[PDB]
Amino acid sequence: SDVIIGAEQTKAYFPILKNKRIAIFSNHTGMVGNKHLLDILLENNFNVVAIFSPEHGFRGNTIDSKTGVPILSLKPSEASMKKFDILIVDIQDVGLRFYTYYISMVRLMDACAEYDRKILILDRPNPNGHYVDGPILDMKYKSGVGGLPIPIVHGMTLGELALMVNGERWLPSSRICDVTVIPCKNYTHQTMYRLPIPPSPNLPNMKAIYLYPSICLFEGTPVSLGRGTTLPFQVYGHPNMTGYNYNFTPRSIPGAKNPPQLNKLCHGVNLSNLSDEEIWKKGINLDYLIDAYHNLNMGDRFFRPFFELLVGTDYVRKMIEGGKSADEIKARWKRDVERFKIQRKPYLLYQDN
């Protein structure tokens, strides 16, 4: 039967929270029915004293007006750390190295470690938890879009990843944080969990989430990936691309106000009718990037300087420019992926794939 997320398992963690001053790291996805975890805890007479959000606050658009709890955008101040005993993580991730909630989580783990506070992670599925793919990030390229030496698609839940951050000593000053994970039930690393609530505005559906590992690489290029359209992360195109049977024009819309190629007719490819199965078969698929590179004929200027910060190694640009195939390039990282699957194994909380 169906996945039971950590936050649903109140008999597992309500006793942990009893009599404690509680902070929560979450956003609008941290819901069980039409209540935020914050609301459920307050209704059960728990003392929630603060919420940390990677956006403004968790109501999807510095004090929550429904509850009066202070709301803190994301390290935390010393003053804030003193206010609570336990921090709860409850947030829906998408499983990519360049999707940044885990970097916020690592920041909070470091702070909690320094201040001797416990973290409780109410685990949620990784919708891309069914595979591991891409180069391990070279730490020459550590950045705002890549915080740990992990593959592009790491395959782990935030709870698993937290355990790995501790065990591999990936926090600053090599601290470990006291972490308890409430694991999901009815969940393996083959389960294909579908997100009820969009995790970001331009990841509106599962097609976008499944294509994201391949298509977000275009953020290291001038190519539009459909922000400003009905099909974000499900198309690619550019005004200069030539010879294509699909076109779109990005528009200035809420959450995509000043999108790439705004008000330009972009020529390209519609991927929105690929089956979920055929996306799963291919994992990170460099076909799209290679197609656009060769079509545009602008040589190395196709790749933004920070392409490497997204892909995590220097050889992808070089091999594309050298005329190598998608399969050749992808094969180069197979060993990295093999090794990471071994490295992560002690930290998995669910059946491996």
* Closest distance to Cl ion from the beta carbon of 227 (Å): 7
Q: Could you tell me how many residues of this chain bind Cl ion (CB under 5 A)?
A: 3
Which residue from 200, 214, 221, 229 is in contact with Cl ion, where contact means CB under 5 A? 200
Region near Cl ion per CB under 5 A, out of 2-10, 74-82, 150-158, 202-210: 202-210
Region near Cl ion per CB under 5 A, out of 21-29, 54-62, 180-188, 194-202: 194-202
* Closest distance to Cl ion from the beta carbon of 306 (Å): 18
Which residue from 53, 128, 202, 224 is in contact with Cl ion, where contact means CB under 5 A? 202
* Closest distance to Cl ion from the beta carbon of 323 (Å): 34
For the record, the structure tokens of 26 come out as: 């979450």
CA distance 135 to 340: 10
* Closest distance to Cl ion from the beta carbon of 58 (Å): 16
Q: How many CA atoms lie within 13 A of 39 on its CB side?
A: 13
Which residue from 172, 201, 322, 346 is in contact with Cl ion, where contact means CB under 5 A? 201
Burial label, 111 (beta-carbon count in 10 A; 0-12, 13-18, 19+) = buried
CA distance 147 to 110: 13
- Residue keyed to tokens 């941290």: 30
CA distance 236 to 205: 17
Which residue number, 100 or 240, has a Cβ lying nearer to Cl ion? Answer: 100
The pairing of beta strand 47-53 with beta strand 21-25:
parallel
For the record, the structure tokens of 112 come out as: 């909690």
Give the number of other Cβ atoms within 10 Å of residue 62's Cβ.
8
Region near Cl ion per CB under 5 A, out of 23-31, 163-171, 195-203, 343-351: 195-203
Q: Is 213 in contact with 150 (CB distance < 8 Å)? A: no
Which residue number, 149 or 204, has a Cβ lying nearer to Cl ion? Answer: 204
Which residue number, 204 or 239, has a Cβ lying nearer to Cl ion? Answer: 204
Region near Cl ion per CB under 5 A, out of 110-118, 198-206, 216-224, 268-276: 198-206
For 246, the enclosing helix (H) or strand (E) is strand 246-248
* Closest distance to Cl ion from the beta carbon of 26 (Å): 18
Region near Cl ion per CB under 5 A, out of 159-167, 196-204, 313-321, 343-351: 196-204
Q: Is 152 in contact with 98 (CB distance < 8 Å)? A: yes
| Residues 6+ positions from 67 with CB-CB distance below 8 Å | 38, 39, 42, 48
Which residue number, 93 or 160, has a Cβ lying nearer to Cl ion? Answer: 93
* Closest distance to Cl ion from the beta carbon of 201 (Å): 4
* Closest distance to Cl ion from the beta carbon of 202 (Å): 4
Which residue number, 200 or 313, has a Cβ lying nearer to Cl ion? Answer: 200
* Closest distance to Cl ion from the beta carbon of 345 (Å): 33
Give the number of other Cβ atoms within 10 Å of residue 277's Cβ.
8
x/- mask, Cl ion, residues 152-191, rule CB under 5 A, reads: ----------------------------------------
Region near Cl ion per CB under 5 A, out of 75-83, 192-200, 328-336, 342-350: 192-200
DSSP H helix total and E strand total for the chain: 12, 11
Dump the DSSP string for 176-242.
Answer: ---EEEE--BS--TT-----SS-SSTT--SHHHHHHHHHHGGGGGSS-B-STTSSSTTSEEEETT--
Which residues of the shown chain bind Cl ion in the complex (CB under 5 A)?
A: 200-202
